[PDB]
Amino acid sequence: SLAHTAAEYMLSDLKGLRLELPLDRIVKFVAVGSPLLLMSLAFAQEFSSGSPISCFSPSNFSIRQAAYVDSSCWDSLLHHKQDDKMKSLWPHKALPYSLLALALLMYLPVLLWQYAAVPALSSDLLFIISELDKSYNRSIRLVQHMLKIRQKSSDPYVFWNELEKARKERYFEFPLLERYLACKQRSHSLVATYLLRNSLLLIFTSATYLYLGHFHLDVFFQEEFSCSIKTGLLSDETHVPNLITCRLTSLSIFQIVSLSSVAIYTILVPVIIYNLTRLCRWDKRLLSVYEMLPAFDLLSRKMLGCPINDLNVILLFLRANISELISFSWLSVLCVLKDNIDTVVDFMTLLAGLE
Amino acid sequence: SLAHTAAEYMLSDLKGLRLELPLDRIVKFVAVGSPLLLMSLAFAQEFSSGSPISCFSPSNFSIRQAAYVDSSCWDSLLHHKQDDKMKSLWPHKALPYSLLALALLMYLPVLLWQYAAVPALSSDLLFIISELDKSYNRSIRLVQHMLKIRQKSSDPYVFWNELEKARKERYFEFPLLERYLACKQRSHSLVATYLLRNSLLLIFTSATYLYLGHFHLDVFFQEEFSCSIKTGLLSDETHVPNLITCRLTSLSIFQIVSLSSVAIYTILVPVIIYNLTRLCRWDKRLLSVYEMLPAFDLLSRKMLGCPINDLNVILLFLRANISELISFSWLSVLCVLKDNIDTVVDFMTLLAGLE
Amino acid sequence: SLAHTAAEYMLSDLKGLRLELPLDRIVKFVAVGSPLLLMSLAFAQEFSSGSPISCFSPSNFSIRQAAYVDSSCWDSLLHHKQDDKMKSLWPHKALPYSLLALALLMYLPVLLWQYAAVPALSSDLLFIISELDKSYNRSIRLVQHMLKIRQKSSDPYVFWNELEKARKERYFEFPLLERYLACKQRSHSLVATYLLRNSLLLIFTSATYLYLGHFHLDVFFQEEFSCSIKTGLLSDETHVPNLITCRLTSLSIFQIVSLSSVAIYTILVPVIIYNLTRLCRWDKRLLSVYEMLPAFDLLSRKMLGCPINDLNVILLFLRANISELISFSWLSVLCVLKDNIDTVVDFMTLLAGLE
Amino acid sequence: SLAHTAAEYMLSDLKGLRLELPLDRIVKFVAVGSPLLLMSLAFAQEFSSGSPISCFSPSNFSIRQAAYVDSSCWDSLLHHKQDDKMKSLWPHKALPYSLLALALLMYLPVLLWQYAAVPALSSDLLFIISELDKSYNRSIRLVQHMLKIRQKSSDPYVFWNELEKARKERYFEFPLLERYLACKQRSHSLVATYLLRNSLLLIFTSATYLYLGHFHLDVFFQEEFSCSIKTGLLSDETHVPNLITCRLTSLSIFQIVSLSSVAIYTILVPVIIYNLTRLCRWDKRLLSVYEMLPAFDLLSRKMLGCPINDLNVILLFLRANISELISFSWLSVLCVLKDNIDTVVDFMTLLAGLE
Amino acid sequence: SLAHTAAEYMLSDLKGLRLELPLDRIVKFVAVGSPLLLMSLAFAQEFSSGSPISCFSPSNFSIRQAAYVDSSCWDSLLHHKQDDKMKSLWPHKALPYSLLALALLMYLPVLLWQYAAVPALSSDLLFIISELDKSYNRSIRLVQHMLKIRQKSSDPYVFWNELEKARKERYFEFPLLERYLACKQRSHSLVATYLLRNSLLLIFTSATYLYLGHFHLDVFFQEEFSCSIKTGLLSDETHVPNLITCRLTSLSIFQIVSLSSVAIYTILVPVIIYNLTRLCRWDKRLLSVYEMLPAFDLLSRKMLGCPINDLNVILLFLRANISELISFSWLSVLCVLKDNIDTVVDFMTLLAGLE
């Protein structure tokens, strides 16, 4: 089927970065995969194929012109309703093309996200990681003598005086990164991509709802109609003027695909809503440990104002990207320090796991 | 067929870690693959296809008339049972969709396992594995200068009297490891994932039994039924009012798929029960060698209280991954000492195979 | 279908260079993919296939006779129009062939570009980047003490008039690149390839429009036609001389294909127009920082005369490749300095991020 | 076809070890592949498909009537044999399903082998090879002073006695192995796995013979039968009471499948018998070179007791792996010493063959 | 198609050794692929498919009566020849099965070759290539000072007398390898594999000719045959006793398959005959250059006795491997010396092209 190749054409599956959320991956996955799956179910071997429309021809007729008549109406689905209001049945014919259209409209926002923000993002995260890769062997290297000063000095002279002068000495400061982050907060050109990506999906879901409301739900329990043939050069013939008892064959598939289309998108709407609201608030679930590391305190320090900035997005992506191989280390081990007190344990643990 | 794609789309097959037990692999593969293979066998080349419904119309009707007659009942399958009680045979129509739904529902728990437990569990293992493997560095060298003191000594003095102070020093102390293991002993945030994984499977099996009992097994030996067409625009016609002897064609497939479905799950229940019960007890099959190594003994030390703790799942997965490439060593070889005596043999075995 | 193999035969996807602009990528993608997708949609399982023609044979005719009569007209599509002017319907038979021909004609410019300009342009670009990377090699490395002694002496007469002296110093000049740029600047053997590539595409689009105008849009609302059979050995037979009410089945597919072939190409025209026009002006968006670098100033200084020079396409390809792996660094970071002043910050940032 | 995907799912094809003997491997291929291949032959394009059953209904019955008549007996195959004993020919319906059952039964033992023996057995092999690697480099390290004394020695001290004294000193000793070898010889936990692996195949081929004997071989020359349709709601009708001359179309493929199934397994049985008997005796085809080698002598020294020991399968799996990359050496080159004896000869070759 | 997949299981395409001659590869390819391709052509879409056999039933018969008549004779191919001698026509039905049998029978010999001689041949070739790699640098480090004394001495002491002694000193010899070659050249265990591999193919070609002669060439031009149905339960019926004018549809496929099968083998046989004859003589077409090199002279020295030896086959595979990457060197450059004379040139050339 056509949906087979299209699956790996759209939803097919640097070198050390994850530039997408798992939630975003799942929502795009389901949004692109649902229409193709329903369409594949609609016209495959699972349901018996054959003639989509059948009509009860008179017994006088032979097979050939009966095939003509019931084939001349499949392309002319238009009900002569006497309940002489003339009604159309085109959605039953146009359903698969509509499904493919929705499938492409689902994939379009992914293309915009890929083209509009990937390179600029890729530069920044890689630069930050390359800078922060070795913040560990700067602390322990120079802050190792704190214990070695402890036994030969007093409480405040070590914890509040010897851990006081080392801070203002060029071994920890990163003024280049400070300048960089200060510049970044002015930028607003990347949050636009994310908000547009979510808003387009919301608009497409609304369009799907209005399409399923205005046109569908009207022919939902109708299985029979009366069509006509004598509307041309066949009007001067001796046969039935209005064909009788024409019944569609694939109503159940229509019902199930409509119901699945409603259900999947209605259950996915909250996921996209939550995706949008994640960026509406500053996040500080673990700042307590971040304010102590020599360079990690910078991101916590610039935690002010409206959360709508590129800093929020880059830190959100980074927090998922702190677990590759080198930040996938001590930074993950700092779970036991969870309850002056940092006098000995906070330094014994740091100097214990050197590498 | 859609089953072919769905096979590798569902059950498709770090870098040194096995986060999946073999029994879990077997149960997940069997449970996900059974409905797919059954539904594929139902509608493939093995059984000749055609019209799943057959009817015996009188010879008066034309071929198209018979086609309309028997094609109008496959989608409207409803028996006029006189034994005028109305009965439906809709499971015969809904079998493949039900099998597909069962296949998806079986894959639901796997996503929860991969999304809620993989990162934390993977992060937890390798650090413990490294702290665990750094053993013969500071254990065979603790003994090389210690075994040489035996001959110039007495029975208790060298290996029964100074051993306790030979193990109480800044060589065996691992406060980081003790604190980490105790902290995860108190925690319970991962065992819930395993419990939910097993409980969802049990609930889904129970729902499968309910569905197979309530709806199925009622129309199981019934293969003929009477239907009617004159329930609409064509009721004003001269023909039979109630159709006679419409017979199901694929009853054998129906019964075989039902029997296979019930049999596979009644076979599968015991192994998942065993998987649930595995975690309820402490593993103490091989602690005799663990309580001797400098780092191994700590694992055996904290075995207290109820067996419902995370430490259990970490140690259980550690047992599976205890033999990768470097731990894939003496661990496997410390199996000859299965029967004071440890004076020479226990130490010559160590000092023989350095590397 | 046939297009399945051709899809990866034509549209299928050094080691560090991008020799293709993303806009050109999407243009080629859509341009070659539209005809294949349309023809795949036209003759696949999405719409019921069979006999594309139906005719109303008299009831006396045999089924073999009717099959012979109707199958004798699809290879002889010639309507006996009385509105005895003879109109033929060859496009309804030849549309797949036309679509495939347009697919090859779309592909021709791609191979033209791949076999006319790739080697020379690739070699030139990789050379240029190779010597251009020496900019950072000199950059600040020789200035390590030149900056370390300036603050010990006075401010504006050790590091404010020695900029020329440092440039005059025999490491900053790049005599090789000057002659190369001049020789390229007079050359015009590369811009002709791009101009012809755009012109050939636009001429082909105009040809598509002419084809869709002259032959199509005439038999566009016509669905019924009359044919004749007695034009040979069948003249001396007793039957109808002119066959009556022959209706083509796939009119909707005809209309859909025509409208799509119009719409996608009308959308495609503006983007190729803009791609053609991108070379009418010089690019001066980030040369402000460039005219400080020791080697990048050579590129900036040679912005003279008519913009139709090979250096235009050279710099166009260069700007995309300026973010590969090594230039994908500080050069991308120098965006903070966007408002004497360059005394410290413009130089503190340089001396901060060495490597 | 279904057999296509199952082929690569079932019989499809560390990093330096061959865990499976060639005989067992080829037996596995033939045993799992014969049913799939013959079943694919049964229902593919090689032989014409269609309606497997044919009946000669009299001309009075219509198209649909005869279709119902000959379609109602394929699922209800029961010959009213007058030679009134009803004989059922259900194997003609249960053939492919029984073949698939046999296919699964064939693949059960291999998963038993791979899940019950591979984990435990994989461990000690690398230990064995690691300590077996030492012997070569130790011999060059040890035996180069030994021959250095030979030229100034008389003869017995390098050829007869002192050499035997010279070897038994702590450079030529492998004490840790000696403890492992005897205890592993005492174990029997692995021979049972091999015995079960072969016994399952023997039992299943015996079951196959019983199935082909009891049920088949009776309906083998029979191709025509008389059935009945008046056994229900069709009893009150005016037509023939018992079907006349219903003939099977696929008797030839039935006979070919039976003959191939019996013949392939009849040829296969002696191979598995020989694979069984391979473990009943010890292999001493090359112990003459082994008994002089540093570590290979120990394997030959422990030649006692019954041939049902784990060391037997251990040495069997090593001999398949003595030719990987390092033992793929002089060991293999020692084929020329096949006929005071090794004056320099042996030593001359070893010292000459550094690596 | 069935033979589609069998192609890639059968004829699908160390790490530096070629264990097959290209002539053997191509003859194996054609021998296994010709029946498969002929089968594919014989039962594919290239011809219109359908019923292989047709009969001219009387017009009184119904459609099912004719279908039963011609479907009851395709599996009962037996001509009631009156030119009442009974003649069969089974080959027209058994052709594909015989073809698949041929495909397997010509496929056994490659398996016999790949399991019988590949390991030992690979061992010998890899040992030889690993050992004989020194000779290049070994010679130059010894023959670098012969030009020192060429000008400072005369003919006897640089060119004809002391060179032999300079050659025969303990930097030249390699006893490990000429001691190796004796048992191999006396061995005859590998020529048997090659001779049986060729003889089997000769036997199978002869058997194919016998099958094509005894059975074919008789049913070659006759196109019509008469069959009968009244030979059982249908004898007591009123219809034709002997069927009239039953015509077979696919005579052309039969003829073309037979002609192609005979022609491909009558052109294939000379290749295998020449391959067999290749080993019947010693090969000496470059030994003028080998007889001078240090280690290559040993191979050219042991050219005695009958050419039926393991040395013949080992050198036959060696010569195909003398151009991999390191013997793909000067050894290939010694072509310019193709015409005392070697006084100066034959050392200048060797000493110049070092690396």
UniProtKB/Swiss-Prot annotation, chains A, B, C, D, E:
Secretion signal, residue range per the UniProt entry: none
GO cellular component, one term: gap junction
Keyword terms of this UniProt record: Cell junction, Cell membrane, Endoplasmic reticulum, Gap junction, Glycoprotein, Ion channel, Ion transport, Membrane, Transmembrane, Transmembrane helix, Transport
Gene: PANX3
Membrane topology qualifier: Multi-pass membrane protein
InterPro entries for this protein: Innexin, Pannexin
GO annotation, biological process: cell-cell signaling; monoatomic cation transport; osteoblast differentiation; positive regulation of interleukin-1 production
Parts of the chain on the Cytoplasmic side: 1-28, 120-200, 274-355
Compartments it resides in: Cell membrane; Cell junction, Gap junction; Endoplasmic reticulum membrane
Record's subunit section: Homoheptameric.
Domain of life, source organism: Eukaryota
Glycosylation site list: N60
Transmembrane stretches, start-end: 29-49, 99-119, 201-221, 253-273
Protein name (record): Pannexin-3
Family: Belongs to the pannexin family.
Purpose: Regulator of osteoblast differentiation by functionning as a Ca(2+) channel in the endoplasmic reticulum which regulates calmodulin (CaM) pathways. Allows ATP release into the extracellular space and activation or purinergic receptors.
